[PDB]
Amino acid sequence: RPLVNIYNCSGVQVGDNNYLTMQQTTALP
Amino acid sequence: RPLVNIYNCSGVQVGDNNYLTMQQTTALP
Amino acid sequence: RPLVNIYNCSGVQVGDNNYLTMQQTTALP
Amino acid sequence: RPLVNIYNCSGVQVGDNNYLTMQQTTALP
Amino acid sequence: RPLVNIYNCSGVQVGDNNYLTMQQTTALP
Numbered sequence: 001r002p003l004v005n006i007y008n009c010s011g012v013q014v015g016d017n018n019y020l021t022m023q024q025t026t027a028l029p
Numbered sequence: 030r031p032l033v034n035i036y037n038c039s040g041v042q043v044g045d046n047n048y049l050t051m052q053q054t055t056a057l058p
Numbered sequence: 059r060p061l062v063n064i065y066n067c068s069g070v071q072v073g074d075n076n077y078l079t080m081q082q083t084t085a086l087p
Numbered sequence: 088r089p090l091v092n093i094y095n096c097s098g099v100q101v102g103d104n105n106y107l108t109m110q111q112t113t114a115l116p
Numbered sequence: 117r118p119l120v121n122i123y124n125c126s127g128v129q130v131g132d133n134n135y136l137t138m139q140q141t142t143a144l145p
Contacts, residue, residue, distance in 0.1 A: 002030040004072065006041050014043045019050075024039040024068065026055045031059040033101065039069045049078050053068040053097065056085045060088045062130065068098045077105050080127070082097035083112045089117045097127040106134050109127040113142045 006012055010022065035041060042049055064070055068080050093099055100107045122128060129136045 002032060004033045004035065004041070004043065006035050006038070008037045009035070010040045012041045012043075015046075016042060016044070016049070017046050019047045021050055021052075022039050022069065023052045024054070026053070028057055032061055033070070033072065034061075034063050035067070035070050036064065037066045038064070042069065042071050044073050044075075045071060045078065046075050048076050049071070051068045051080045051098065053081070054083045054085075057087050060090060062091050062093065062099070062101065064093045064096075064099050066095045067093070070099050070101070071107070072101050074100060074103050074105055074107065078100070078107045079109065080098045080107075081110045081112075083114070085114045087116060090119050091128070091130070092119075092121045093125075093128050094123045096122065096125050099128045099130070100136070101130045103129065103132055103134065103136070106136060107129070108137050108139070110139045111126045111141070113140075115143055115145045
């Protein structure tokens with residue numbers, strides 16, 4: 001089976017039969 | 030089998046049986 | 059098999075059994 | 088086999104059993 | 117085999133078993 005490497009993330013969801021909105025803002029100084 | 034490398038992401042969704050929405054805003058100075 | 063490297067992204071969807079939409083806004087200086 | 092390197096992107100869709108759309112907006116000053 | 121390097125793009129679609137559309141809007145100064 002294939003492997004998925006995840007390093008930085010807000011969270012990991014597997015088997016989501018529902019829904020969840022996600023927002024991310026990236027800004028630099 | 031293929032390998033997937035994810036470094037930076039808002040989140041990782043595997044096995045999405047529903048709709049999923051994501052918003053991302055990038056701003057630079 | 060081919061390898062896919064993802065560095066920066068809003069999110070990664072693997073095994074999408076439904077529709078998925080993403081919005082990305084980039085503000086340049 | 089070919090290799091695909093993705094640095095910056097709105098998102099990456101692998102294994103789309105449905106349809107996926109993305110909106111990208113670039114603003115300039 | 118050819119190599120594909122994507123630095124910046126609207127999105128990346130791999131394994132399109134249906135259709136994919138994207139909207140790109142660029143605001144000019």
